[PDB]
From a paper:
In mammals, the E3 ligase Pirh2 mediates the degradation of aberrant nascent polypeptides by targeting the C-terminal polyalanine degrons (polyAla/C-degrons). The E3 ligase Pirh2 (p53-induced RING-H2 protein), also known as Rchy1 (RING finger and CHY zinc finger domain-containing protein 1), encompasses nine zinc binding sites throughout the full-length protein, with six in the N-terminal domain (NTD or CHY zinc finger), two in the central RING domain and one in the C-terminal domain (CTD). Here, we present the crystal structure of Pirh2 bound to the polyAla/C-degron, which shows that the N-terminal domain and the RING domain of Pirh2 form a narrow groove encapsulating the alanine residues of the polyAla/C-degron. Affinity measurements in vitro and global protein stability assays in cells further demonstrate that Pirh2 recognizes a C-terminal A/S-X-A-A motif for substrate degradation.
To better understand the recognition mode of the Ala6/C-degron by Pirh2, we determined the crystal structure of the Pirh2 NTD + RING domains bound to the Ala6/C-degron by fusion of a linker and a six-Ala peptide at the C-terminus. Specifically, the methyl groups of Ala-1, Ala-2, Ala-4, and Ala-5 each point toward a closed cavity inside the groove walls, while the methyl groups of Ala-3 and Ala-6 point toward the groove opening. Concretely, the free carboxyl group of Ala-1 is positioned to form two hydrogen bonds with the hydroxyl group of Tyr23 and one salt bridge with Arg41. The Ala-2 is accommodated in a narrow pocket created by NTD and RING, where a backbone hydrogen bond is formed between the amide group of Ala-2 and the carbonyl oxygen of Ser155, and the side chain of Ile107 establishes a hydrophobic interaction with the methyl group of Ala-2. The backbone carbonyl and amide groups form two direct hydrogen bonds with the guanidine group of Arg109 and the backbone carbonyl group of Cys125, respectively. Structural superposition shows that the E2-binding site is located opposite to the Ala6/C-degron binding surface.
Author numbering: 15 to 202
Write the structure that this text describes.
């Protein structure tokens, strides 16, 4: 671990971005360096870092057999060391597991810690929204979301910064004290 990959991932291959047909270590490396956003489900090809064989996406290299990722999901085309990831069909992406700690809430439409099942306030597709603090997406973020007792969602980082200046939901102004607050599963 820690020999091959980027700042985001420990992986043995590079993705061929079907948009600009460039080779980037991962979708974040691509998105940080391109006008547009990479569609991870559209990725068809990868290149072995070790032997530069460009090939269809798979867990090991067809020529030299280098291990591309300890965890490999052929839907998101994600490669990584073992972080107990699982791919959730309702989220549509890979989550940081383990899968048994989480359930997918249909209404809020993200994976939530088991202790919130039937024990939180649902807001329709609230996960598919921007964080009201930073106004960047919650659902696909690699930062754990925090369910406020009111059911609104904040990035854990944005939530903890907000506590230095206040203690109320940035949208509905309800206090963050109380029942129904907890953690969601991070994007892998
Ligand atoms: Na490398
Ligand atoms: Na990726
Ligand atoms: Na849906
Ligand atoms: Na999606
Ligand atoms: Na589930
Ligand atoms: Na953020
Ligand atoms: Na995590
Ligand atoms: Zn591109
Ligand atoms: Zn990267
Ligand atoms: Zn190879
Ligand atoms: Zn996946
Ligand atoms: Zn889910
Ligand atoms: Zn819910
Ligand atoms: Zn945020
Ligand atoms: Zn709120």
């Amino acid at each position: 671990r820690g020999q091959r990959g980027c700042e985001h991932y420990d992986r043995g291959c590079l993705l061929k971005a079907p948009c600009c047909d460039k080779l980037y270590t991962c979708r974040l490396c691509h998105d940080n360096n391109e006008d547009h956003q990479l569609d991870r489900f559209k990725v068809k090809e990868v290149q072995c870092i070790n032997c530069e064989k460009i090939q269809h996406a798979q867990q090991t290299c067809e020529e030299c057999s280098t291990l591309f990722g300890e965890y490999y999901c052929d839907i998101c085309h994600l490669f990584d060391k073992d972080k107990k990831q699982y791919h959730c069909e309702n989220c549509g992406i890979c989550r940081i597991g383990p899968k048994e700690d989480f359930f997918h809430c249909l209404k809020c439409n993200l994976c939530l810690a088991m202790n919130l099942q039937g024990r939180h306030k649902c807001i329709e597709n609230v996960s598919r929204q921007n964080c009201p603090i930073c106004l960047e997406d919650i659902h696909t973020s690699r930062v754990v979301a925090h369910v406020l007792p009111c059911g609104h969602l904040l990035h854990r980082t944005c939530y903890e910064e907000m506590l230095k200046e206040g203690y109320r939901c940035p949208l509905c102004m309800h206090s963050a004290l109380g029942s129904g607050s907890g953690a969601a599963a991070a994007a892998a």
